[PDB]
Design a protein around this nucleic acid. Structure first.
Ligand code: ZN
Ligand code: ZN
Lengths: 55, 56
RNA sequence: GGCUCGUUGGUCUAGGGGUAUGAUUCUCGCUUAGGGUGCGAGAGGUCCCGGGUUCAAAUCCCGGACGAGCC
């Protein structure tokens, strides 16, 4: 015995997989210097306002 | 119905920066009898001292 | 090595039917000889992936290593 007990979720229902990335790389195309929010692969339109974020 | 996922604790980190300190030795200069907050080398403690030097 | 499916993004956290919270960090200021350290701001999610079930079940039930197919 070690006078201590408890548990952990063992990530059985809490783990995933994602390709090689960093906080200076894009999750959509894997390039460096930007993020998916600015990815050059995207059509960058059309867009506009919505009540859910403007009212 | 019941569920369980372990029997003992786990860790995902630790520390060593505390360097086995004693609350009688300054972390700023290593001298004994005071703390950094009262170091005689600080510009605003324990009594606002100032260093000196020469060139002649 | 190429082609096809790319937007998984703090990290951690128990989760027995419904948006998060807490632990900690990172960035800036104060020192820059501080690890007895702190405080405010900036950075945190419709919280494993797919199929089945009544309005709804992260452990509702089932499969499941670090992906798969073709050249
Ligand atoms: Zn991109
Ligand atoms: Zn000192």
């Amino acid at each position: 015995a070690t006078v201590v007990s408890g548990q952990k979720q063992d990530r059985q229902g809490g783990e995933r997989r994602r390709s090689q990335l960093d906080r200076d790389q894009c999750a959509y195309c894997k390039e460096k210097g930007h993020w998916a929010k600015d990815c050059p692969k995207k059509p960058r339109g059309p867009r506009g306002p919505r009540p859910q974020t403007s009212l």
